[PDB]
Design an enzyme around this catalytic site. Structure first.
Site, short mmCIF file in Angstrom:
data_model
loop_
_atom_site.label_atom_id
_atom_site.label_comp_id
_atom_site.label_asym_id
_atom_site.label_seq_id
_atom_site.Cartn_x
_atom_site.Cartn_y
_atom_site.Cartn_z
N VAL A 189 6.41 80.37 41.15
CA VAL A 189 6.74 81.62 41.84
C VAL A 189 5.71 81.83 42.93
CG1 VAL A 189 7.29 84.05 41.57
CG2 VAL A 189 7.64 82.48 39.66
N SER A 241 -15.71 77.68 34.69
CA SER A 241 -16.92 78.47 34.49
C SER A 241 -16.63 79.72 33.66
CB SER A 241 -17.53 78.88 35.83
OG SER A 241 -16.72 79.83 36.49
N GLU A 249 24.25 92.16 79.13
CA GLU A 249 25.70 92.20 79.31
C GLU A 249 26.32 93.36 78.55
OE1 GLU A 249 27.67 88.59 78.20
OE2 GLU A 249 29.68 89.35 78.68
N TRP A 271 28.69 85.06 83.32
CA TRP A 271 29.93 85.27 84.06
C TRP A 271 29.87 84.68 85.46
CZ3 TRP A 271 34.30 87.27 81.85
CH2 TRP A 271 34.15 87.89 80.60
N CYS A 283 38.30 88.87 75.13
CA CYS A 283 38.18 88.16 73.86
C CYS A 283 37.89 89.09 72.69
CB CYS A 283 37.07 87.10 73.95
SG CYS A 283 37.43 85.74 75.09
N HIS A 284 37.07 90.12 72.88
CA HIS A 284 36.84 91.13 71.85
C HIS A 284 37.83 92.27 72.09
CE1 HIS A 284 33.51 89.63 74.24
NE2 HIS A 284 33.37 90.81 74.81
N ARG A 327 40.88 87.64 69.59
CA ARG A 327 41.95 86.67 69.76
C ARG A 327 41.39 85.29 70.07
NH1 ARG A 327 42.27 84.61 74.66
NH2 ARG A 327 41.38 85.82 76.40
N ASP A 347 34.94 80.98 71.23
CA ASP A 347 34.24 79.70 71.22
C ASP A 347 33.09 79.78 70.23
OD1 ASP A 347 32.93 77.15 72.17
OD2 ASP A 347 31.52 78.60 73.03
N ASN A 364 28.78 87.43 70.51
CA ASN A 364 29.60 88.55 70.05
C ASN A 364 28.99 89.20 68.81
OD1 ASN A 364 32.34 86.44 70.90
ND2 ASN A 364 31.57 88.17 72.12
#
Ligand SMILES: NC(=O)C1=CN([C@@H]2O[C@H](COP(=O)(O)OP(=O)(O)OC[C@H]3O[C@@H](n4cnc5c(N)ncnc54)[C@H](OP(=O)(O)O)[C@@H]3O)[C@@H](O)[C@H]2O)C=CC1
Ligand SMILES: NC(=O)C1=CN([C@@H]2O[C@H](COP(=O)(O)OP(=O)(O)OC[C@H]3O[C@@H](n4cnc5c(N)ncnc54)[C@H](OP(=O)(O)O)[C@@H]3O)[C@@H](O)[C@H]2O)C=CC1
Ligand SMILES: CN(Cc1cnc2nc(N)nc(N)c2n1)c1ccc(C(=O)N[C@@H](CCC(=O)O)C(=O)O)cc1
Ligand SMILES: CN(Cc1cnc2nc(N)nc(N)c2n1)c1ccc(C(=O)N[C@@H](CCC(=O)O)C(=O)O)cc1
Lengths: 503, 503
Positions: A7, A76, A278, A300, A386-387, A407, A410, A418
């Site tokens: 541990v 000791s 962004e 972009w 995409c979002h 939808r 990548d 994202n």
């Protein structure tokens, strides 16, 4: 022939465990984990034994531990039978008489400095390693935890936790009915693609990240890594508009915890400033790509050039003039779009402002929805969104959660952006509304992998993930637009090196 | 002391196995499964033994089976050593000498009429039962499969398959590491709701449908049943406008196969006719609620009355003028809504027609999206949409799949209806476009259960599900609007009785 376990709590990268005779950190839950793992026994009449060196014995103040026997290895220290809670032996090997001689001991634990960790790992008697991976590297250590030999394999990796803005994991290493699997394989031979299991095969060991962790995939970075593996296993080859061929599977899901960590991928260094830049670009309602390139962000650039804005059907736009995109659909949904150099203040409906208003005055509602998919303005925008949808939810304990439907995604470059973008967005909304961050769940339609990323994504799957960082704000803002990069503190981010994936 | 297993194919309700000395059906894949389960051995030099009565021996025409030994139990058949593939014994008990005496046999199988099934089950010789649940009850049987004793418990239930429009399952019954689970439980005690596992606890055995099936939950009705169990386990209590409280969990998913069956719930009878009538109503683009009430359909009756039209703000509408809802957003998205009985031909964008056009002329595209969530017209609707988004996908083998996102979903009455509604919709779209149905995936935001349904939903969870029915079309239509209830054939639907859940 009982059970011996190590541990230890050590740093994630340097693997340090102590500094100047004390612990380098003060994590209350780590000590609680230490007590619960060392008291866990089955027989009420036996006890557990804890082995540690003298310096570790001095480190904890030479004070006993309740319901446990402490074995101190020293040359000791005096031996007296007046205290049965502390026993002194002269060497580690001869101190492992708890299995042979004493039948009042159930399990042994090794937890005492590198002098004992080193010897215990070399002597082939340790069966398990309980590791707490602390995310602290700024300070210096003088005692480290030795490297884990190849004979041990990871079998469990907990989610990331937080304590005083410090991230840490919990890991287990182990030295290393059936008629159902044979019946399912026989059914898969009779039916081809007719059996849905053959369309959703489990990824092979050669593309599975850390295959020895078969049941303890608690760490939520596995939600992304295992999705990456599923595309590599049964993704269908798909040519497309250009020459960048993909491999697609349809209908996938991954979820992440935001209450105790920030889901910034650690299997590869993720540029977080450009993600943040962004996002505020979306939040501010801006559509001008030049504002992004003026901040060292080229996400972009390939979608907003003159060549790409003339072969899709447009061409009358400015140099980098995307149409109604994310942000313009969040702040000014519908509404006529002219050019990038205009002020759209007050046009359309502001979903984001209406969302914040409904989150604070009607939290138990079920209409906290932010969409960016406008079918009327699809052919006048540079790239379809995409979002496309995001829904938000206020739990009973005042936490803000988020669902996202994509939808397109990548997995190479889109998903890491994202996940962090909508996690920051949820945390920003959570502070403004007076809530705490909750959970994030990503729903993906066409989950695809570009063919030129195969060699690179297969490298990411070879890296065992590390605990997630922490994302905390410095000040408390009044509106969602006032957030700036100066207000963000990324704590304990220790990723693997970058993976150059060209788009 | 080897392994004896029963292999049988019996009807789902009556559990009949034969009629007039022959099989009541002709399911090719069932016989293939019989061959694969009875040849499955580990040693290449041993054989498997097949026990059957003389009548069963006469049933298969007294012809041997390749690579297997057939043991016939008869009191008249002669015993001759000229054929080593067929051996005749005078009683079942003395025929079980393959474990004691014969070392050239690996596994034994019992597969020969009820006379032998009865004796093998009463004599405690059977270790496993391979059951094929055929969905045929119209014809009568003269030989049945005896009831499975309580000592057996189901451990596997395959998905539903189809062969000549006949549904059948595959089930397994069996007579009846660790440090990871103890560490996770200890971690769950230290952190309360701070550990995401405690917020997504596994449901208790008293609310888990068929708890003995721990790994073979292949049947996709379990996707709904286990979602129902998760709400009952960690659903949060939520008061609302009145007193009808719900229990909600956020971010859930369930998926279903449509290549070999129709996902109509069998743990309770689902009214399919009223589901279909509202779906074609959506496709036609109609917004007038009276068209539904003229066909014995009251789905949009309580939400379109005068009492409901004075608390949302739209008091100037007609008696049943719901407004821009599903269908108007599919056929005439955006635009402008006037009244219910006027002509909106040519206004807005027709997402459904654009979807059908793109599904057949651009199948590898990724914009096959049908949305119904319009932020501009949200306050102009009777009730905001629940099926806010649906995306469609054409696989490489010409199959049409569907993703659905629901912001809200009552699991009690809404989910069973939504699953069937969008399954029919995908099947109708698939025929028009020239494809076959693929998979269905439901993404749910606020998955909730009304408080007055608890006792009733726990009754549904006590019913072991049955194989899914088949839904096939009779004729081939030309447009998506020409579908009628006469063209729908529901085959082999054998549900448990209805459960009256009042709203
Ligand atoms: N992060 C974590 O999980 C943990 C961290 N720590 C930290 O580690 C530090 C202490 O560990 P460390 O400095 O490595 O010292 P150790 O705990 O390993 O103890 C060393 C001492 O034990 C005795 N000893 C060791 N090996 C032998 C042997 N083969 N034969 C006889 N006696 C032996 C010696 O004592 P003697 O002088 O009597 O001969 C030696 O000086 C502390 O700062 C502590 O806080 C400790 C435990 C856990
Ligand atoms: N759907 C499925 O999975 C299966 C269906 N079937 C169907 O079932 C039907 C036949 O089965 P079923 O009618 O029950 O007859 P059985 O297959 O059980 O065979 C019965 C015969 O076996 C002998 N026998 C049975 N019990 C004893 C005993 N205790 N001692 C000595 N001999 C015994 C008798 O032969 P004797 O005359 O010599 O006394 C008896 O006539 C067929 O239609 C067949 O197609 C069969 C197998 C599988
Ligand atoms: C040897 N040592 C250093 C130390 C600190 N953290 C660790 N953490 C881990 N995961 N593993 C270790 N070996 C470990 N060791 C220890 C051991 C016990 C206590 C301790 O205070 N235990 C109390 C815990 C008090 C509480 O419940 O928080 C107990 O009663 O067991 C402190 C330092
Ligand atoms: C005893 N019997 C009746 C019968 C029919 N269906 C069943 N189905 C099941 N699931 N279990 C049974 N015991 C069963 N029994 C049988 C057994 C084998 C064949 C048969 O033709 N077997 C071929 C199968 C040919 C093929 O591969 O399709 C073989 O080579 O084993 C027919 C009837």
């Amino acid at each position: 022939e009982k059970n011996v376990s190590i541990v230890v709590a050590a740093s994630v990268l340097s693997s340090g465990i102590g500094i100047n005779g004390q612990l380098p950190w003060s994590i209350s839950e780590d000590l609680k984990f230490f007590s619960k793992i060392t008291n866990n026994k089955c027989d009420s009449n036996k006890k557990n034994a804890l082995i540690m060196g003298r310096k570790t014995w001095d480190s904890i103040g030479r004070r006993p531990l309740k319901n446990r026997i402490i074995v101190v290895i020293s040359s000791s220290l005096p031996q007296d039978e007046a205290d049965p809670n502390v026993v002194v032996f002269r060497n580690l090997e001869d101190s492992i008489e708890n299995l042979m001689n004493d039948d009042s001991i159930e399990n042994i634990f090794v937890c005492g400095g590198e002098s004992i960790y080193r010897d215990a790992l070399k002597d082939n008697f340790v069966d398990r390693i309980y590791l707490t991976r602390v995310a602290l590297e700024d300070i210096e250590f003088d005692t480290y935890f030795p490297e884990i030999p190849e004979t041990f394999l990871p079998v469990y990796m907990s989610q990331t936790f937080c304590t005083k803005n410090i991230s840490y994991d919990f890991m287990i290493f182990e030295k290393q009915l059936k008629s159902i699997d044979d019946t399912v394989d026989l059914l898969g031979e009779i039916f081809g693609i007719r059996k849905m299991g053959n369309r959703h095969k489990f990824p092979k060991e050669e593309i599975y990240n850390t295959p020895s962790i078969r049941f303890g995939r608690e760490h939520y970075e596995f939600q992304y890594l295992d999705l990456l593996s599923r595309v590599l296993e049964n993704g269908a080859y798909r040519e497309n508009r250009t020459g960048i061929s993909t491999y697609s599977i349809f209908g996938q899901m991954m979820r992440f915890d935001m209450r105790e960590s920030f889901p910034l991928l650690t299997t590869k260094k993720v540029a977080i400033r450009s993600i943040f830049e962004e996002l505020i670009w979306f939040i501010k309602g801006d559509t001008n790509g030049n504002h992004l390139i003026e901040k060292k962000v080229y996400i972009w650039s390939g979608n907003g050039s003159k060549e790409y804005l003339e072969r899709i059907g447009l061409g009358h736009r400015e140099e980098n003039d995307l149409g109604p995109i994310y942000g313009f659909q969040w702040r000014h949904y519908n509404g006529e779009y002219k050019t990038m150099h205009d002020d759209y203040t007050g046009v359309g409906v502001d979903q984001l402002a209406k969302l914040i208003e409904t989150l604070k005055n009607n939290p138990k509602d079920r209409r906290h929805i932010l969409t960016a998919w406008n079918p009327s303005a699809l052919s006048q925008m540079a790239l379809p969104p995409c979002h496309v949808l995001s829904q938000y939810y206020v739990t009973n304990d005042n936490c803000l959660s988020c669902n996202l439907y994509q939808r397109s995604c990548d997995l190479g470059l889109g998903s890491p952006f994202n996940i962090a973008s909508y996690a920051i967005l949820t945390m920003m909304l959570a502070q403004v509304c007076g809530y705490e961050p909750g959970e994030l769940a990503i729903f993906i339609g066409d989950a695809h992998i570009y063919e030129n990323h195969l060699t690179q994504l297969k490298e990411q799957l070879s890296r065992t993930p590390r605990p997630f960082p922490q994302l905390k704000f410095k000040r408390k803002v009044e509106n969602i637009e006032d957030f700036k990069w100066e207000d963000i503190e990324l704590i304990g981010y220790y990723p693997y090196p970058t993976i150059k994936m060209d788009m």
